[PDB]
């Protein structure tokens, strides 16, 4: 159904729905066409309803007659029950959680509830016409007829201004819309009240053609203005078929009642449904060998749904309520509570932390209470508008402008944001203020003659958008001056992406509409083969292959990756509904263990075991580590980590204190204290370490301009209009760079073919067909690297030293073999936990939510770190307060170690520095500090930026953890 732009499949009826006004409160005013039975006139034209005029023909026998178009009804769920006889209350209460309460002696409907917080009240005039519509109690809408019973204008009843201006003609049917936004859409019908053409306000005209005559006509050949949507329909008996503008025919077979029985695909995928004579689906057959069986008890309610070779959900209801208990066939099971007033409370999920709700005399929520903080508080005024909202101890304030739009937002720190509005919606400007007279971070938005964003002005620049009269983002213009254009094809599919350099990215699609090939700027090729269910099976890279393989359950089971050499052969074992717990390859076999209720209390990584314990509120306490060391984590109100204790009594504890905004503010120890200070916008500007002070001064473009340090430090940076670093002066010299507004060096010692560099600073690099750097020849040093079939480094040599790397089945480095020995690493999810170098066990402690290191344990000792706002380790001091490790990084990120009492392989964010190759490996890629760009492409090359080898705009205000 609705396969055609807006047409049916069981019949030739054409159905179109449009919205006229969209108020921020939630009031919706729509209208349907209903081409079938278009002979009657309900005051809005021949076959037109404003979706707000319900009509029960008689007391109960007659149909409700929905605007779209006890004596219980099992097929639909009607529960129309009579009430006191004089004032005829009916209260339809159908199975779609609605309630249409009609009254006699006045012939009108009111109290249309659409949930718990959605109501509608009607007020008619002396005649049988509605003249007032209200949300709950206050006047919202107002009709205005032309003394003929036809609606024309729609007022706001608060401000005198027309909202929708209907325009009829000499045939008693509207030919104009003139909605709230101000877009006039034209409609021309045939000589039998059948729609012929519809001209959109933008300029795209749709046409319709009918085969039959009268109300039983069939709409076929639904073509557009320029053949953009060429749909051809064909009906024969109880079987229909339709083809789009790409010659893709889809067929459907229905039954006498009108339900869908069979659906076919041009590729060969077939879906089947078998009912149980009661209008409820009993058996579902997918294209693959899998049958789903539904089992219903008395009153139905879908109490069982069993999938082939799997489990069942087994929904639960007590007598008439909502979901009371969810079985969740895994080791867990959850429940809730439902009284006969709504307001679901006492929801017990797999873990603890029940959810209580406290309400006021009205129906809106007031307080949401959980275990160990996480309390939500809301304040309401005389109206239904929010005033105060507290989620974690913020208590923001909202101030209105005598309208339903938010005008001012007040923060607990003094920051006040003011929003300006015009005579319509689509806000155009937002500004932030502070306790002092200043302006900062103000954004503006300007629109075209239509209701589309034309340009956006940011303190960084101006970004413009040009549409192709179809709202498809035809072109985007950057603040610098470059432009990026898109070229589409039939059915509005992205085909070509062109930029200012001249290179174009190309896409290809199969008969199913999915991506089946991408051609990049440098020149590549792909196939993207899919199965009969929509899952990628063969990547079919120009040189390598991945060879996925599923286990007929929906999860990945095997990966036979290999291009003839260095086969990967990854294996997994997924259970029913997740819970992988196993990942094997030729090198590593990661195993996991879960508890009864479900908790990763034991993880196995080869021969090492970590283990951890959970609390009643689900928090992780008393973390276990190998070599017989344990940690202790405490908590406080609002559920935040503020105390970390160790198992050794000779180790001090760390205390954390947050600010009024919920950010990490102060971290202290017995002989160390760090303080951070922002400016009121959300950027760190001052850092203190009780003996060291660092300050940051920004420019007018919201960029780090000056960095002042107490220990003989004052660095200045100057960037371009886009943000790339143009020049940098640290103490006595100014280093300058240049770019081509795309992330590539454009100096006198640069050479690029399409996007990759060939020579820089007298260093030559070689690239293969895949795009990776295999050979690097500098000023006398040759480095040759051999990778795997999964774009990961295997070995590196050529510099009188051999190095090999071995990863696990998840892409994380586990073993590193070199001339110094063998180094084993221990990972915790996607973050490095520790390492072993045959001389002891080192543990790295990071922030609770970021990758900033704080302390490191080694040989029963602890050393505290001192980093800047970026997150790179700058200093490392022992408990006595002496300088143990100190270095200085350049603009590119090269480590200049001065004191090397202890080794520190940390880097910007979660990266690991290699001593033999001078590369930073974070999770899956390698970064060169002497070059500033990566050495290999990522699988998110097109979905992560324009340049595939670009790390970031500038390494002063941007990070990139977890590799790609």
């Amino acid at each position: 159904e609705k396969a055609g732009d807006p047409v049916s499949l069981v019949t030739g009826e054409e159905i179109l729905t449009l919205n006229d006004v969209e108020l921020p409160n939630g009031f919706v005013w729509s209208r349907t066409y209903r081409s079938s039975k278009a002979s009657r006139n309900q005051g809005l034209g021949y076959g037109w309803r404003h979706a707000f005029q319900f009509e029960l023909k008689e007391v109960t026998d007659e149909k409700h007659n929905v605007t779209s178009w006890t004596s219980y009804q099992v097929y639909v769920g009607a529960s129309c029950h009579f009430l006191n006889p004089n004032i005829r209350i009916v209260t339809l209460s159908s199975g779609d959680q609605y309630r249409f309460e009609l009254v006699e002696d006045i012939w009108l409907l009111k109290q249309v509830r659409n949930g718990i917080f959605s109501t509608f009240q009607l007020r008619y005039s002396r005649n049988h016409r509605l003249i007032e519509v209200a949300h709950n109690k206050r006047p919202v809408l107002e009709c205005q007829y032309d003394k003929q019973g036809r609606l024309v204008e729609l007022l706001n009843a608060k401000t005198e201004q027309v909202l929708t201006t209907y325009i009829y003609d000499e045939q008693d049917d509207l030919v104009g819309a003139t909605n709230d936004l101000g877009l006039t859409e034209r409609y021309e019908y045939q000589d039998q009240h059948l729609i012929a053409k519809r001209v959109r306000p933008t300029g795209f005209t749709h046409y319709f053609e009918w085969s039959g005559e009268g109300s039983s006509a069939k709409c076929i050949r639904n073509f557009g203005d320029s053949g953009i949507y060429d749909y051809r329909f064909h009906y024969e008996g109880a079987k229909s078929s339709y083809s789009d503008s790409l010659d893709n025919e889809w067929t459907f077979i229905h039954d006498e009642q009108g339900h869908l029985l069979e659906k076919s695909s041009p590729t060969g995928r077939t879906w089947q449904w078998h009912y149980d004579h009661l209008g409820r689906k009993e058996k579902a057959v997918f294209p693959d060998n899998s049958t789903t069986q539904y089992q219903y008890n008395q009153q139905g309610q879908l109490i069982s749904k069993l999938h082939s070779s799997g489990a069942q959900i087994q929904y639960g209801y007590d007598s008439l309520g909502k979901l009371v208990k969810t079985v969740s066939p895994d080791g867990d099971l959850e429940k809730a509570y439902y009284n006969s007033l709504g307001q679901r409370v006492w929801d017990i999920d797999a873990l603890g932390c029940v959810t209580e709700y406290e309400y006021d005399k009205h129906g809106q929520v007031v307080k949401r209470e959980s275990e160990d903080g996480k309390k939500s508080r809301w304040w309401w005024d005389k109206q239904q508008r929010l005033v105060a909202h507290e989620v974690d101890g913020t208590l923001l304030r909202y101030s209105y402008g005598a309208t339903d739009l938010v005008n001012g937002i007040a923060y607990p720190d003094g920051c006040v944001a003011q929003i300006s509005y015009d005579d319509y919606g689509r806000r155009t400007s937002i500004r932030y203020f502070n306790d002092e007279d200043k302006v900062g971070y103000s954004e503006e938005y300007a629109y075209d003659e239509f209701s589309r964003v034309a340009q956006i002005q940011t303190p960084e620049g101006v970004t413009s958008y040009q549409w192709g009269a179809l709202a498809q983002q035809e072109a985007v213009i950057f603040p610098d001056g470059s432009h990026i254009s898109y070229e589409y094809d039939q059915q509005r599919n992205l085909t070509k992406l062109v930029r200012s350099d001249g290179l174009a990215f190309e896409f290809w699609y199969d008969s199913e509409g999915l991506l089946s090939g991408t051609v990049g700027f440098d020149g590549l090729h792909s196939q993207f083969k899919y199965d009969s269910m929509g899952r990628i099976i063969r990547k079919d890279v120009a040189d390598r292959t991945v060879l996925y393989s599923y286990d007929d359950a929906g999860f990945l089971q095997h990966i036979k990756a290999g291009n003839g050499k260095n086969i990967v052969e990854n294996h997994f074992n997924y259970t029913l509904g997740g819970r992988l717990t196993l990942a094997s390859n030729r090198h590593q076999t990661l195993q996991y263990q879960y508890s009864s209720f479900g908790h990763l209390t034991k993880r196995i990584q080869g021969q090492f075991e970590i283990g951890e314990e959970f609390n009643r509120v689900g928090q992780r306490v008393s973390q276990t580590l190998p070599d017989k060391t344990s940690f202790n984590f405490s908590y406080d109100t609002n559920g935040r980590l503020s105390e970390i204790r160790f198992s050794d009594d000779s180790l001090p504890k760390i205390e954390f204190q947050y600010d009024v905004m919920g950010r990490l503010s102060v971290t202290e120890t017995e002989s160390f204290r760090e303080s951070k200070l922002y400016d009121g916008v959300g950027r760190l500007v001052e850092q203190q370490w009780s003996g060291r002070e660092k300050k940051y001064i920004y420019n007018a473009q919201n960029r780090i301009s000056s960095i002042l340090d107490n220990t003989a430090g004052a660095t200045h940076y100057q960037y371009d209009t886009l943000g790339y670093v143009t020049k940098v002066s640290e103490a006595g010299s100014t280093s300058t760079f240049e770019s081509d507004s795309f992330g590539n060096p454009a100096l006198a010692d640069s050479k690029v073919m399409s996007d990759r560099i060939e020579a820089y600073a007298g260093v030559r690099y070689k690239y293969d067909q895949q795009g990776n750097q295999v050979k690097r020849e500098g000023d006398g040093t040759v480095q040759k690297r051999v990778f795997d079939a999964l774009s990961q480094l295997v070995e590196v040599h050529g510099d009188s030293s051999i190095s090999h790397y071995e990863y696990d089945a998840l892409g994380r480095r586990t073993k590193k073999i070199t001339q110094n020995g063998i180094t084993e690493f221990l990972w915790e999810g996607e973050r490095l936990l520790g390492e072993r170098t045959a001389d002891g066990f080192r543990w790295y402690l990071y922030q609770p939510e970021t990758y900033i290191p704080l302390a490191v344990l080694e040989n029963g000792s602890i050393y505290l770190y001192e980093c800047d706002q970026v997150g790179k380790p700058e200093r490392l001091k022992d408990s006595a307060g002496n300088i143990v490790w100190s270095a200085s990084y350049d603009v590119h990120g090269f480590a200049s170690i001065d004191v090397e009492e202890v080794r520190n392989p940390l880097r910007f964010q979660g990266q690991y520095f290699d001593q033999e190759t001078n590369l930073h490996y974070n999770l899956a890629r390698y970064y060169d500090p002497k070059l500033g760009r990566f050495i290999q492409q990522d699988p998110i090359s097109i979905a992560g930026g324009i340049n595939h080898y670009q790390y970031a705009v500038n390494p002063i205000q941007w990070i990139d953890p977890t590799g790609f």
Partner: protein, 75 residues
Amino acid sequence: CEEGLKRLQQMLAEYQAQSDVPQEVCDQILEAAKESSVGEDGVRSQVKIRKPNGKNNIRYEYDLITFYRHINYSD
């Protein structure tokens, strides 16, 4: 297909990104790469940054069915 109007919210959402690719192509690109985006299923992480994620800004932003909680499955 898609014929609805793009409000300011969607424009601001796609503006703060770095791909400049529509959602229908970005989702297909993310689905076509499964061997690199594989992760632990059912493990509460404390890094707030997933594998399909990537580059981000160090600046803080606190910009403002919405009352209840999807438990496991709402058919």
